[PDB]
Amino acid sequence: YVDVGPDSVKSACIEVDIQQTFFDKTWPRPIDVSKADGIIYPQGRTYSNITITYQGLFPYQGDHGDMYVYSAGHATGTTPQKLFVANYSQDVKQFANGFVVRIGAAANSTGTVIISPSTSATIRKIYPAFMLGSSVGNFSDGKMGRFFNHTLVLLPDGCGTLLRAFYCILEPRSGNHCPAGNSYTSFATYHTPATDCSDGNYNRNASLNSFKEYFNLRNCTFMYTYNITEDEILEWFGITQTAQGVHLFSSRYVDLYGGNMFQFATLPVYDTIKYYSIIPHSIRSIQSDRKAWAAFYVYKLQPLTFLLDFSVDGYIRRAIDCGFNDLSQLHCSYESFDVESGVYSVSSFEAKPSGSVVEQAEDTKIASQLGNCVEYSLYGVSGRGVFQNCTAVGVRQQRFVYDAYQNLVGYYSDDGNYYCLRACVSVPVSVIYDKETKTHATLFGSVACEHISSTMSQYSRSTRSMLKRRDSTYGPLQTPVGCVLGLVNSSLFVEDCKLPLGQSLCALPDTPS
Amino acid sequence: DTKIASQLGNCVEYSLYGVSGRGVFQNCTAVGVRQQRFVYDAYQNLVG
Ligand SMILES: *[C@@H]1O[C@H](CO)[C@@H](O[C@@H]2O[C@H](CO)[C@@H](O)[C@H](O)[C@H]2NC(C)=O)[C@H](O)[C@H]1NC(C)=O
Ligand SMILES: *[C@@H]1O[C@H](CO)[C@@H](O[C@@H]2O[C@H](CO)[C@@H](O)[C@H](O)[C@H]2NC(C)=O)[C@H](O)[C@H]1NC(C)=O
Ligand SMILES: *[C@@H]1O[C@H](CO)[C@@H](O[C@@H]2O[C@H](CO)[C@@H](O)[C@H](O)[C@H]2NC(C)=O)[C@H](O)[C@H]1NC(C)=O
Ligand SMILES: *[C@@H]1O[C@H](CO)[C@@H](O)[C@H](O)[C@H]1NC(C)=O
Ligand SMILES: *[C@@H]1O[C@H](CO)[C@@H](O)[C@H](O)[C@H]1NC(C)=O
Ligand SMILES: *[C@@H]1O[C@H](CO)[C@@H](O)[C@H](O)[C@H]1NC(C)=O
Ligand SMILES: *[C@@H]1O[C@H](CO)[C@@H](O)[C@H](O)[C@H]1NC(C)=O
Ligand SMILES: *[C@@H]1O[C@H](CO)[C@@H](O)[C@H](O)[C@H]1NC(C)=O
Ligand SMILES: *[C@@H]1O[C@H](CO)[C@@H](O)[C@H](O)[C@H]1NC(C)=O
Ligand SMILES: *[C@@H]1O[C@H](CO)[C@@H](O)[C@H](O)[C@H]1NC(C)=O
């Protein structure tokens, strides 16, 4: 196995007090895909200044992410005391095709101490620590997140210039405040700047040794290290897993200023990762020496399609999440960032299922429910649709009435009533796009505004919020063609809008640029 | 193995780290991104 070095020496662990309510903050950072935030550059290829579609794992454009903040522990006077940290060790998550993170984005600005926030200390970048693996379970005290068998460990040591990776078995310890003890609270790791990080001798084993004090390393099968140099600039990092093993990505090695990720390293492990957590960490520094740290963020990858704008220097500079909006769908269909003005069809709202209705004599109370769009089963016949009470058509006791295209038309219930079936209905959608002002509006077709609402329970695509930027303040407007959003009743007469809606309707642009 | 590292050239068969095809090479300017090694167009033809 790997030569891990010496075992832990002290038996007792420094106590970990959970102060998690101090860490509740709301500093969201949604992905800006027009800036190419979070984009993993494609593997093995590069391109010219041409725009191409691409498919791969990416963050959603609308995701605000998850936020975590490292902070100094308790100290008083001129000396260190006990840790006062966040409860992040209990935040077990299901792994889901990797994740990406944002690090140091609040650099060269100020924030607060958090644990004693009134001091208002300036903030600086700090690197994250992580643990990954195939299984989790209870600590002997019932605490969440104990990993089993072998797990990944990623930790910086001391100052951010050294990074280590491990695939190893963790071992519980019988010391006071440690995992086999009944005095255990929660796992944490720490750095002590009062003796660590000398400028002529940075302590390369600093965080690993504090890690060893809570878990003895055993049976380690892999270890790696990497070299980093200090730089307060914002950075991107992330993890994916394939049948070739885990991949590590960073923007630092290749594209430090543009922020595009590149495949920095790979790992030999072939075990599937099923769970993910963040290791909490804290600074042991003296009370007058405290320093606030920049916020850390996490976003989750999904197998999304995107337009990618490539620079002549091959950097991705802009991108569009195709499924984010109906307008984004339009751009992807024309493979461009500048669609010509017009009225364009976009995908329709579907239906929205309703709770099931079942009849099969031979469970309650679903015998009938008229009715909207409730899934159904009738003596092994199934489908989704709306039922209505109707007349009586021949022939009775054949039970299922059908049309010439073999669509079910209606049904004889065992309550003696004929009901008819219309399947379900949908709302067609189109958008009005004015390229000159870069503005838009929408049309719901013949649906009528009695079925239209500010939010949707159908549905089609994840948001329509760009319309809502003006339409949070207005009711839907009925027109002879149909219900529309953000149209306004100006009652103007004009010869040609270059955006006719059909009929005598006309969609004037707001006054020209 | 030698001496076939470069030959400019008209339409010589080639192999580049397991990528292969036939074509002419020319000493032109550089382009982004560096260290992705293979430059391609929108139809996935190798460009450079
Ligand atoms: C790279 O794309 C740019 C456009 O983004 C192209 O630049 C155009 O070049 C023509 C020259 O015939 C000009 O008339 C246009 O005004 C330019 N567009 C601009 C400046 O936006 C350029 O040809 C492309 N180069 C390659 C190698 O594909
Ligand atoms: C990574 O950075 C370290 C410096 O932190 C380099 O390792 C040291 O290089 C000096 C050169 O004189 C030696 O005196 C030290 O003994 C080295 N330390 C160790 C632990 O070997 C190292 O070269 C850099 N690169 C890599 C790939 O590790
Ligand atoms: C905080 O300080 C960093 C220092 O790393 C500054 O980053 C500069 O970012 C610009 C962006 O174009 C680069 O051109 C400079 O080279 C960077 N300075 C360096 C590397 O010393 C930046 O002024 C501050 N803010 C952020 C967010 O990084
Ligand atoms: C840790 O704190 C978070 C705060 O959002 C909470 O949701 C979570 O349940 C906590 N973990 C526990 C109580 O195990
Ligand atoms: C931890 O123990 C509880 C019982 O207190 C159990 O319900 C839970 O499933 C256990 N955790 C895991 C990951 O199985
Ligand atoms: C470790 O992996 C084995 C492999 O099957 C699994 O059965 C077991 O639940 C895991 N955990 C422990 C504590 O052995
Ligand atoms: C691996 O870990 C087991 C614990 O289950 C330990 O007993 C064994 O000595 C280790 N073996 C080697 C060869 O690393
Ligand atoms: C519709 O069903 C009602 C009971 O809900 C019944 O009284 C009525 O006769 C039915 N209408 C017909 C058969 O036209
Ligand atoms: C719009 O303006 C005209 C002006 O006469 C008015 O008659 C009409 O009721 C208004 N509203 C709608 C929904 O068309
Ligand atoms: C062409 O190649 C020569 C060497 O064969 C080199 O010196 C020169 O810089 C190249 N021309 C470029 C890169 O434009």
Q: Is the CB of A48 under 6 A from ligand 1?
A: yes
How far is residue A333's CA from residue A327's CA, in Å, rounded to a whole number?
10
Q: Strand A387-389 to strand A418-421: parallel, antiparallel, or no bridges (unpaired)? A: antiparallel
Q: Which of A135, A138, A139 to mutate to test the pocket of ligand 5 (most atoms within 8 A of CB)?
A: A138
Q: Is the preceding peptide bond at B3 cis, omega within 30 degrees of 0?
A: yes
Q: At how many Å resolution was this determined?
A: 3.6
B40 → closest Cβ in A45, A311, A313 = A45
How many residues would you count in chain A? Answer: 513
Quickly tell me which residue has 């769908």 as its tokens. A329
Contact A400, A345 (CB under 8 A): no
Inter-chain CB proximity A312 and B35 less than 8 Å? no
Inter-chain CB proximity A50 and B42 less than 8 Å? yes
The candidate with the shortest Cα–Cα distance to A442, out of A489, A496, A483, A479, is A483
Inter-chain CB proximity A50 and B41 less than 8 Å? yes
Contact A505, A479 (CB under 8 A): yes
Tokens of A233: 């600039």
How far is residue A334's CA from residue A341's CA, in Å, rounded to a whole number?
12
Alpha helix segments (H runs only) across chain B = none
Contact A461, A455 (CB under 8 A): no
Atom of ligand 7 nearest to the CA of A218: 2
Give the chain A residue nearest B33 (alpha carbons). Answer: A314
Contacts of A221 (CB under 8 A, 6+ apart): A1, A2, A150, A167, A168
Q: Which of A103, A124, A229, A233 to mutate to test the pocket of ligand 3 (most atoms within 8 A of CB)?
A: A233
Q: Whose CA is nearest to atom 9 of ligand 5?
A: A137
How far is residue A387's CA from residue A406's CA, in Å, rounded to a whole number?
17
| Structural biology method used | cryo-EM
Produce one character per residue of B6-31: b if its CB has 16 or more CB atoms within 10 Å, e if not: eeeeeeeebeeeeeeeeeeeeeeeeb
Give the chain B residue nearest A44 (alpha carbons). Answer: B36
Check the CA dihedral A113-A117-A122-A127 and report its sign.
positive
Provide the strand spans (E) within A183-295: 189-191, 216-227, 235-242, 245-250, 262-266, 275-279, 281-283, 292-293
Long-range contacts of A391-396 (CB under 8 A, 24+ apart): A391/A418, A392/A418, A393/A418
Tokens of A405: 């295209």
Q: Whose CA is nearest to atom 14 of ligand 3?
A: A257
Atom of ligand 7 nearest to the CA of A219: 14
- Phi, psi values for residue A467, rounded to 5°: -70, -40
A-B CB pairs within 8 A amount to 43
